[PDB]
Design a protein around this ligand. Structure first.
Ligand SMILES: [Cl-]
Ligand SMILES: [Cl-]
Length: 195
């Protein structure tokens, strides 16, 4: 009997830093040998990031520890005997709730100290999967790109920039917010401007 997946690999949605477990059940005679792959590159069990467990009745399990977005990909499992070889595939998607990560806080909030005319960037790392929506406000007036401010949003941070150089009036309290479907998080940064 050529190998068969009696129970196929399942797609997984797993929360960041948890362990992800991929399981399948394999039939075949002679008993198939199972290899595991991350996007087409063989995974070698090392006992730490990757562990393999096999049980009676043809069950085969891979445990991927402490899952990062790096682990969020397509996985293959292959079963092979002298009668044939077949693979199954599943995806792992890693849910990270939206979150703002202030490098430095003073008295509760972020703080940026600037001199007049300095081209300031308020740079704010964040997390979230799905990628979150980002907004900035000053107190409570939304900011988009106009003639005064520029917003940068990349995969991992957002920056509020004062491309024309800060003016004394730029002093105040800026609120940055990251939102996805696993949640919302906001933080405030105080800017002060020195002359
Ligand atoms: Cl990036
Ligand atoms: Cl000014």
């Amino acid at each position: 009997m050529a190998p068969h997946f009696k129970e196929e690999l399942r797609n997984l949605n797993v929360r960041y830093q948890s362990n992800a477990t991929l399981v399948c059940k394999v039939t075949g005679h002679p008993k198939p040998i199972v290899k595991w792959y991350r996007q087409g590159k063989e995974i070698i069990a090392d006992g730490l990031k990757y562990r393999i467990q096999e049980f009676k009745g043809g069950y085969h399990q891979l445990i991927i520890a402490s899952v990062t977005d790096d682990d969020a990909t397509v996985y293959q499992v292959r079963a092979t005997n002298q009668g044939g070889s077949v693979s199954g595939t599943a995806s792992l998607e890693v849910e990270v709730p939206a979150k703002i990560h202030l490098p430095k806080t003073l008295e509760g909030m972020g703080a940026v100290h600037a001199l007049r005319g300095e081209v300031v960037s308020i740079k704010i790392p964040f997390s979230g999967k799905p990628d979150p929506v980002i907004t900035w406000q000053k107190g409570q007036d939304l900011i988009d790109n106009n003639g005064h401010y520029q917003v940068i949003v990349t995969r991992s941070f957002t920056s509020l920039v004062f491309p024309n150089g800060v003016e004394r009036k730029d002093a105040g309290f800026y609120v940055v917010c990251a939102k996805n479907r696993f949640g919302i998080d906001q933080k405030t940064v105080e800017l002060d401007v020195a002359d």
